Design a protein around this nucleic acid. Structure first.
Ligand SMILES: [Cl-]
Ligand SMILES: [Cl-]
Ligand SMILES: [Cl-]
Ligand SMILES: [Cl-]
Ligand SMILES: [K+]
Ligand SMILES: [Mg+2]
Ligand SMILES: [Mg+2]
Ligand SMILES: [Mg+2]
Ligand SMILES: [Mg+2]
Ligand SMILES: [Mg+2]
Ligand SMILES: [Mg+2]
Ligand SMILES: [Mg+2]
Ligand SMILES: [Mg+2]
Ligand SMILES: [Mg+2]
Ligand SMILES: [Mg+2]
Ligand SMILES: [Mg+2]
Ligand SMILES: [Mg+2]
Ligand SMILES: [Mg+2]
Ligand SMILES: [Mg+2]
Ligand SMILES: [Mg+2]
Ligand code: NA
Ligand code: NA
Ligand code: NA
Ligand code: NA
Ligand code: NA
Ligand code: NA
Ligand code: NA
Ligand code: NA
Ligand code: NA
Ligand code: NA
Ligand code: NA
Lengths: 237, 194, 92, 56
RNA sequence: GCUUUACUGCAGGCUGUCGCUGAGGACUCUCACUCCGGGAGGAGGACACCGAUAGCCGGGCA
RNA sequence: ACUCGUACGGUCACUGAAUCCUGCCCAGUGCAGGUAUCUGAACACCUCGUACAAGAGGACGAAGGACCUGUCAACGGCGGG
RNA sequence: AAACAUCUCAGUAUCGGGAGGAACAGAAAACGCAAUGUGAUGUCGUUAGUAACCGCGAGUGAACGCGAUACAGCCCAAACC
């Protein structure tokens, strides 16, 4: 049997790779020696082809010009600050410890220094619940209670572009255009429509999977399709 | 009485005990950041080195060589292969890690030829061996009775022909008696059955 | 069928007719040191191993009598041919 | 559209050109590697034992 | 060529154990080793990774 | 590779616009969770044995299974009297 | 092998690296016609399709020794300077 489509992806051929050369920049926080002195101005508001969300262009004191992840409510001319003693204003990036409890935050660091990792997409946000000298418990958009090093920086506010998901694509044409600007193969042929040779759900006199859809975690790649290690399925119950 | 060498040689009989063990745990740290083929100025095991051919002369070079630990990094068969030849993990090469080291080294130093080699430790994911090479184009050695022979043309690229000491040991040419039926005078003239 | 425990039959050892006790041959243990037990560990490797990959065959509808006939005086036993008996219960 | 006669018409791309090393028209100007002598891939002339019979 | 609860295998996943590997049936610590950090240092810590072995699964493959 | 990506995500599958709806079955098969007890390999540990070794036996016991639960918009089912 | 998985084809075909005019091997931690015996290594003849291996199936298959060819023997390490 030939390799299934999921295996082709792993090679990282052109068809599957993301259009990097077309992308703008990796949105990371600013590395400050210390002091918190670092502050800049919002020059413009652009659209990041990589996240479909907006982005803010900023110019600091020391000459630095770097595009940053634009939360909601930031405009041209405004002022942002990066550091330990930064003001608690929307957009200002600072460690979790300095941030008061119950405030919506985005672009949270998974480890201090990495430059952000959590809460980055359209209109999402984390939630700072607890404080300690050792821990800092954050509520990630998925609802999980992430325990974090209070030294990890995070931006105040919710990510802009909220409400994108709300309106349907309406037509194949529009989806096509979204996907072209991503490293995803599109469209998608259901494995049950393929031949016996091309995918486990293939073949048969009609369209149906011969094997039960759920499948073990331990299964080798090439067979790992369908409902993976499902803790259950359906909605009923 | 016992020479200074005999101490180094004894210390190395149990590299996990005493001062040597305290030494290994140190160096190894610095050894893991070092490249594959590194030229060191002096033999770690001076005794063994000398006992293999080492001399503090011009044209005598030493070097440490680090190799990944393991079994056959053999790729799985793509075409039809019966159950017996279906191995990838288990089967191992017929060439020992020490010999692999000698080659990586001889290559790194093209013009030089390989005298001998010896182990100098190993951790959980690599083994080290030092290598004694000689510059057969240097008058010091062309004139040195004790090493002269290495210049002979028919000694060129010897490590690759298995002519090392570690080579003959790998080829099963130790005992001149029983067992050597299939190895002497060479593996190829015996149809490769050892 | 039924078969008595002790009965007077001829023993090929002392050379005469005396009382013979009938006992069922009990399986003696394997050492794991025989030649077939050293070849199993030898010939076995990657993939198929030939005969060592052969699992137990089968059963016949009725087994023959596997017995030992131990005499009373000398104490020696003798193996005799077997007949197809579904069950063999001794009397006393 | 047949792969035959009709698809012969587009064939006007250049590929194998005169190899500087061996002198054959086997220098793939898109790969810059010779199919014959191997110039561009190996410093050693490409040669295989199957270019002739086994006992030869 | 394809399939499977056909025979025998193999990758692969899970798991015990061996080594890497150190200090005082549950626990502390740091020095190996890991990761982040430009650095100072931060996090993990004899675990993880990797080499060996053992049992289970194993048409993804032969 | 995905990824200059971070759950309003990207992966894996099924169904295939809107509209009205989508019943009952977890027995079997599958996946997932638990599990007193039961089953369960090798090293180390014990006895036996061998001046050593082969080998016999004991104790402990992981994943897995037995056993219980969950789950069908999971494979699939929805009869006879 | 009258299928076929060990086995066979076969360490063959093919691939990677390399030397010379020839290569390789080589002066016993050897042989074990057990001896009061032989005395580096190739190669030729023989031992011999013998011993040994093998779903003990098909098939695979040496050595010591003898008879010849050609013969040849050496140097470090360390002790002590
Ligand atoms: Cl999408
Ligand atoms: Cl060499
Ligand atoms: Cl009986
Ligand atoms: Cl003789
Ligand atoms: K075969
Ligand atoms: Mg990034
Ligand atoms: Mg949707
Ligand atoms: Mg794409
Ligand atoms: Mg589709
Ligand atoms: Mg079709
Ligand atoms: Mg299939
Ligand atoms: Mg259908
Ligand atoms: Mg269907
Ligand atoms: Mg096997
Ligand atoms: Mg890194
Ligand atoms: Mg098949
Ligand atoms: Mg020869
Ligand atoms: Mg047969
Ligand atoms: Mg053979
Ligand atoms: Mg002999
Ligand atoms: Na199907
Ligand atoms: Na060389
Ligand atoms: Na052999
Ligand atoms: Na053997
Ligand atoms: Na076919
Ligand atoms: Na059921
Ligand atoms: Na069920
Ligand atoms: Na045949
Ligand atoms: Na056939
Ligand atoms: Na004789
Ligand atoms: Na066989």
């Amino acid at each position: 049997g030939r390799r299934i489509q999921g295996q082709r992806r792993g090679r990282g051929t052109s068809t599957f790779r993301a259009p990097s050369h077309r992308y703008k920049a990796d949105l990371e926080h600013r590395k400050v020696e210390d002091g918190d002195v670092i502050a800049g101005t919002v020059v413009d508001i652009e659209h990041d082809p990589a996240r479909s969300a907006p982005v803010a262009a900023v110019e600091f004191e020391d000459g630095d010009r770097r595009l940053i992840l634009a939360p909601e409510g930031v405009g041209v001319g405004d002022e942002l600050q990066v550091g330990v003693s930064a003001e608690i204003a929307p957009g200002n990036t600072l460690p979790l410890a300095e941030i008061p409890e119950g405030v919506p935050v985005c672009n949270v660091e998974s480890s201090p220094g990495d430059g952000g990792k959590f809460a980055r997409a359209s209109g999402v946000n984390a939630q700072l619940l607890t404080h300690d000298r050792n821990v800092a418990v954050v509520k990630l958009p998925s609802g999980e209670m992430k325990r974090l090093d209070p030294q990890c920086r995070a931006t105040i506010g919710v990510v802009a572009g909220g409400g994108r998901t709300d309106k349907p694509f309406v037509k194949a044409g529009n989806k096509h255009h979204k996907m072209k600007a991503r490293g995803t193969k599109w469209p998608n042929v259901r494995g049950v429509a393929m031949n016996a040779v091309d995918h486990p759900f293939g073949g048969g006199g009609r369209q149906h999977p011969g094997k039960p859809k759920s499948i073990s975690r331990n299964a080798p790649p090439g067979r790992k399709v369908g409902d993976i290690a499902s803790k259950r399925t359906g909605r009923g119950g | 009485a016992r020479s200074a060498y005999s101490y180094i040689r004894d210390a190395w009989e149990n590299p996990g005990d005493g001062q040597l063990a305290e030494l290994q745990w140190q160096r190894q740290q610095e050894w893991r950041n070092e490249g594959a083929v590194e030229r060191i100025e002096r033999p770690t095991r001076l005794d063994k080195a000398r006992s293999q051919g080492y001399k503090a002369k011009q044209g005598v070079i030493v070097a440490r060589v680090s190799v990944r630990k393991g079994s056959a990094r053999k790729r799985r068969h793509k075409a039809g292969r019966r159950s017996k030849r279906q191995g990838v993990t288990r089967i191992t090469r017929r060439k020992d890690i020490q010999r692999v080291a000698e080659e990586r080294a001889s290559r790194t130093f093209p013009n030089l030829r390989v005298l001998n080699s010896y182990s100098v430790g190993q951790d959980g994911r690599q083994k080290w061996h030092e290598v004694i090479l000689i510059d057969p184009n240097h008058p010091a050695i062309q004139n040195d009775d004790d090493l002269s022979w290495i210049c002979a043309d028919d000694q060129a690229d010897r490590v690759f022909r298995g002519l090392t000491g570690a080579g003959r040991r790998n080829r099963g040419l130790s005992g001149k008696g029983k067992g050597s039926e299939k190895t002497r005078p060479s593996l190829r003239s015996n149809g490769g059955k050892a | 069928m039924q078969m008595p425990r002790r009965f007077n039959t001829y023993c090929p050892h002392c050379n005469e007719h005396q009382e013979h006790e009938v006992e069922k041959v009990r399986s003696g243990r394997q050492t794991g040191m025989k030649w077939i037990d050293r070849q199993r560990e030898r010939n076995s490797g990657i993939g198929n191993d030939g005969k060592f990959s052969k699992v137990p065959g089968g059963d016949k509808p009725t087994k023959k009598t596997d017995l030992k006939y131990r005499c009373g005086e000398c104490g020696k036993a003798h193996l005799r041919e077997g007949w197809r008996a579904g069950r063999l219960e001794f009397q006393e | 559209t047949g792969a035959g006669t009709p698809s012969q018409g587009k064939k006007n791309t250049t590929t194998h050109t005169k190899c500087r090393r061996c002198g054959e028209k086997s220098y793939h100007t898109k790969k810059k590697v010779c199919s014959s002598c191997g110039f561009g891939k190996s410093a050693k002339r490409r040669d295989y034992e199957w270019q002739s019979k086994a006992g030869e």
